[PDB]
């Protein structure tokens, strides 16, 4: 039987034309395989869709059948209102329930209400030529290999780690801290902060901040860290003046910039190295944008939605977006097409080989906690706050935030 579905998407600018062509290819395949089902693509600017169009359709109880959806508050509100299709059974039928890095941003009371299309990871960009100058012939696999790479770089008077964390950019220090204390304490520590089951003051979390301070005190983190903006820290790396940079994968376009980058012919990438505890082989990431589906569906619409999901959420489709546009997969194990750029392949392998991902701590704690950590790590690197006093300050605001509801 005939069924028409509107597919609200955000791939409207010319820079998104290959992602749109990817979507259209998936649609055509789905329409061949489910005769009678047709998809009317409705491209709308991302912020217009989020803040205006989808929001009003949801208030009216009439979303399109398929729509670009953000995780977090948006998905929480629309699921609560009953307008999002629960996806648990479809994922199980398609064998997809364990194939994504992280669905928590689309999960409400155990039920999955959306599927991220792409996201970000964090890791070390590094300069292969500066590494070779210091005798480092491969990326550090482990923390001990990481510290001796740092020692070798310092001995050659090469700034080891670029970082711009001054003024209002404490969040950039928190990227590195984030992953250091997940490496020292494991991912479960930060999951429990907002629940009261774990604490910022736990010794393995404290250890991460002690290691962070030691990187700064030994000159491995750029001594000028607190006098540099985030973008200037990126600049320190990509103009060739630091051996590595911990940053999110959104920074690839800056690292490969046609006008500003001098390292784009000799840049590599590696995950945060293994310390040997509960955080080995994990990669930090976030996946907050993808497709949600209307709950207000007849049987024909439910069949076409499942068929679209089956054809869209595949390793091949994920891999095409990665290779062409440096769109970081939401799905695990995605291979990079051989035609991709070397840095794209480097990030893809670091992500694809990861055992699992963990969220940014700020996806797990209250805004006030996030703001406090940003100020605190600046004072930590600045020698004005000890690691012990940082974690007590953090748990004090964490306790107050948790009492905010309960």
Same-domain pairing of 199 and 95: no
Same domain as 158, residue 138: yes
Same-domain pairing of 74 and 168: no
Q: Are 317 and 18 in contact (CB under 8 A)?
A: no
Q: What is the resolution of this structure in A?
A: 1.8
325: nearest Cα among 17, 12, 85:
17
Do 72 and 137 reside in the same domain of the chain? Answer: no
Number of domains comprising the chain: 2
Residues 267 and 374 grouped into a single domain: yes
222 in the same domain as 82: no
38 vs 21: CA distance, rounded Å: 16
Question: Collapsing DSSP states into helix, strand and coil, what is residue 59?
Answer: helix
Residues 279 and 378 in one domain: yes
- Reference 178, options 200, 154, 160; nearest CA is 200
* Same domain, yes or no: 174 and 212: yes
Residue 269 contacts residue 347 (beta carbons within 8 Å): yes
Going along 272-398, which residue ranges are E strands?
282-293, 328-329, 356-358
Residues 301 and 183 both lie in one domain: no
**262 plus 405 within the same structural domain:** yes
Judged on CB neighbours under 10 Å (0-12, 13-18, 19+), 97 is middle
Query: What is the number of alpha carbons within 13 Å of residue 3 lying toward its C-beta?
Result: 19
Q: What stretches of 301-360 adopt beta strand conformation (E)?
A: 328-329, 356-358
My answer on whether 53 and 65 are in the same domain is: yes
Q: What is the largest CA-CA distance in the chain?
A: 72
One domain, residues 317 and 404: no
Domain of residue 240 covers: 121-285+360-406
Name the token pair of 251. Answer: 């920074």
Pairing type for strands 161-162 and 356-358 reads unpaired
């Amino acid at each position: 039987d005939s069924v028409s579905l509107t597919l609200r998407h955000i791939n409207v600018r010319d820079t998104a034309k290959n992602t749109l062509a990817l979507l259209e290819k998936v649609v055509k395949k789905t329409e061949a395989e489910v005769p009678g089902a047709t998809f009317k693509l409705d491209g709308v600017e991302d912020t217009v869709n989020r803040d205006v169009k989808l929001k009003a359709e949801m208030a009216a109880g009439k979303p399109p059948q398929i729509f670009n959806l953000f995780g977090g508050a948006d998905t929480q509100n629309y699921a609560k209102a009953g307008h999002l299709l629960p996806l648990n059974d479809i994922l199980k039928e398609l064998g997809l329930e364990d194939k994504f890095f992280e669905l928590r941003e689309f999960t409400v009371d155990g039920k999955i209400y959306g599927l991220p299309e792409a996201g970000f990871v964090e890791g070390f960009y590094y300069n292969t030529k500066l590494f070779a100058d210091a005798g480092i012939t491969s990326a550090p696999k482990t923390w001990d290999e990481f510290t001796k790479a740092l020692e070798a770089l310092k001995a050659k008077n090469i700034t080891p780690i670029a970082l711009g964390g001054g003024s209002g950019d404490g969040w950039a220090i928190n990227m590195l801290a984030n992953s250091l204390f997940v490496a020292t304490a494991g991912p479960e520590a930060q999951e429990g902060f907002a629940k009261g089951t774990t604490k910022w003051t736990d010794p393995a979390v404290l250890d991460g901040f002690k290691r962070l301070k030691d990187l700064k005190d030994k000159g491995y983190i750029d001594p000028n860290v607190l006098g540099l903006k985030y973008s200037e820290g990126q600049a320190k790396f990509y103009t060739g003046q630091a051996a590595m940079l911990f940053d999110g994968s959104w920074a690839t376009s800056a690292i490969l910039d046609k006008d500003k980058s001098t390292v784009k012919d000799n840049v590599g990438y590696f995950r945060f190295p293994n310390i040997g505890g509960k955080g080995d082989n994990l990669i930090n990431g976030g996946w907050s944008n993808g497709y949600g589906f209307s709950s207000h569906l007849n049987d024909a619409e439910k069949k076409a939605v499942k068929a679209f999901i089956k054809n869209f959420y595949t390793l091949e489709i994920q891999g095409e977006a990665l290779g062409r546009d440096n769109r970081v997969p939401s799905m695990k194990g995605v291979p990079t097409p051989a035609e991709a750029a070397p840095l794209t392949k480097a990030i893809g392998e670091a992500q694809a080989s990861a055992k699992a991902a963990f969220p940014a701590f700020d996806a797990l704690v209250q805004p006030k906690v996030k703001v406090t950590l940003e100020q605190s790590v600046q004072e930590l690197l600045g020698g004005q706050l000890t690691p012990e006093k940082l974690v007590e300050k953090m748990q004090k605001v964490q306790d107050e935030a948790n009492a905010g509801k309960l």
